[PDB]
């Protein structure tokens, strides 16, 4: 039961994110910017809601199938796939925050979105 997430999807994750790690206030506008700091408050906040786009596992960590369905936007699967899997590391710190953070990271250097506009003929 993997499906891909929306901008409604990430509005709502983002607001249980929130909330469950009481996350501050200027935190959260910047999160609504899709602006985020290199630092713990974020890469916590990164790693929940990538958990709940079934991205990332605490245990497993990146899950890089999902990672592809949700990153491919039409691509070919392979090609994204290669690209993903270069951004894949182990848990070196013992810290799933810091984790996920570092996968989000290289997918942004790599111009892999989490959201693209579609366009349907």
């Given at each position: 039961e993997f499906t891909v997430s929306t901008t409604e999807d990430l509005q709502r994750y983002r607001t249980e994110c929130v909330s469950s790690l009481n996350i501050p206030a200027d935190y959260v506008e910047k999160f609504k910017k899709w602006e985020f700091p290199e630092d713990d408050t974020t890469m916590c906040y990164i790693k929940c809601v990538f958990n709940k786009m079934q991205?990332?596992?605490?245990?497993?960590?990146?899950?890089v199938d999902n990672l592809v369905h949700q990153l491919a936007h039409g691509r070919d699967a392979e090609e994204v796939r290669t690209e993903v899997l270069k951004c894949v590391d182990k848990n070196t710190d013992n810290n799933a925050c810091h984790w996920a953070f570092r996968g989000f990271k290289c997918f942004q250097k790599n111009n892999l979105s989490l959201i693209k506009a579609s366009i349907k003929k």
């Open positions: 991205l990332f596992d605490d245990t497993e960590g990146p899950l």
